[PDB]
Design a protein around this ligand. Sequence first.
Ligand SMILES: *[C@@H]1O[C@H](CO[C@@H]2O[C@@H](C)[C@@H](O)[C@@H](O)[C@@H]2O)[C@@H](O[C@@H]2O[C@H](CO)[C@@H](O)[C@H](O)[C@H]2NC(C)=O)[C@H](O)[C@H]1NC(C)=O
Ligand SMILES: *[C@@H]1O[C@H](CO[C@@H]2O[C@@H](C)[C@@H](O)[C@@H](O)[C@@H]2O)[C@@H](O)[C@H](O)[C@H]1NC(C)=O
Length: 178
Amino acid sequence: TYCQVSQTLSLEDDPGRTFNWTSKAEQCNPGELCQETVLLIKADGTRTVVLASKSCVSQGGEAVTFIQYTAPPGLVAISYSNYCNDSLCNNKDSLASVWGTRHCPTCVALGSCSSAPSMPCANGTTQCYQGRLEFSGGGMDATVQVKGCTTTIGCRLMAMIDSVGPMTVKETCSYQSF
Ligand SMILES: *[C@@H]1O[C@H](CO[C@@H]2O[C@@H](C)[C@@H](O)[C@@H](O)[C@@H]2O)[C@@H](O[C@@H]2O[C@H](CO)[C@@H](O)[C@H](O)[C@H]2NC(C)=O)[C@H](O)[C@H]1NC(C)=O
Ligand SMILES: *[C@@H]1O[C@H](CO[C@@H]2O[C@@H](C)[C@@H](O)[C@@H](O)[C@@H]2O)[C@@H](O)[C@H](O)[C@H]1NC(C)=O
């Protein structure tokens, strides 16, 4: 009936090393458990967008879920979600265990990219991608603009998955296949 609670959005140089996810505890309503959910999104050569949620929650079992939505080279999207049902269980402190050539405008930002310089695409990329990710729920409401060379096909940076712990995801994009 106590859980760590925090909602953070950040751009992160080296979130594997530096990110401190330890948060203050708060009392849940009865018949609520804890969750810790983080989503990390990166383009080639960019910083990493980090959506990190800790809260009391009423829906769900005690699964631990690790997903790679989209694989390098290029765009990378990865999540860790731990739902757990004893006081202060959502206590992960660190993201260490979690995280004729073509050219594409490349960037990541919360909101809108200030710029999207052109970068050469590695072997294995299928397309240029210009997308927008809409997040809602869990006190985590946000947009992420993502452009770059990617392995994903069409508007599938988030692999057609609608939700990430307490967050809902909508994806819209343009893409230019090779
Ligand atoms: C989350 O835990 C609650 C609390 O359960 C109690 O404490 C646990 C550590 C364990 O020892 C349980 O046996 C205890 O009951 C769960 O609530 C209970 O669930 C049972 C079975 O559905 C039900 O008949 C009891 O009356 C429930 N008690 C309350 C307070 O509602 C809850 O279901 C757990 N949820 C998950 C997803 O694990
Ligand atoms: C991470 O931070 C911990 C203490 O944090 C402080 O407590 C939390 C609840 C935050 O609200 C923060 O703003 C406070 O200053 C440290 O005890 C812990 O050791 C830190 N981890 C590392 C690896 O440095």
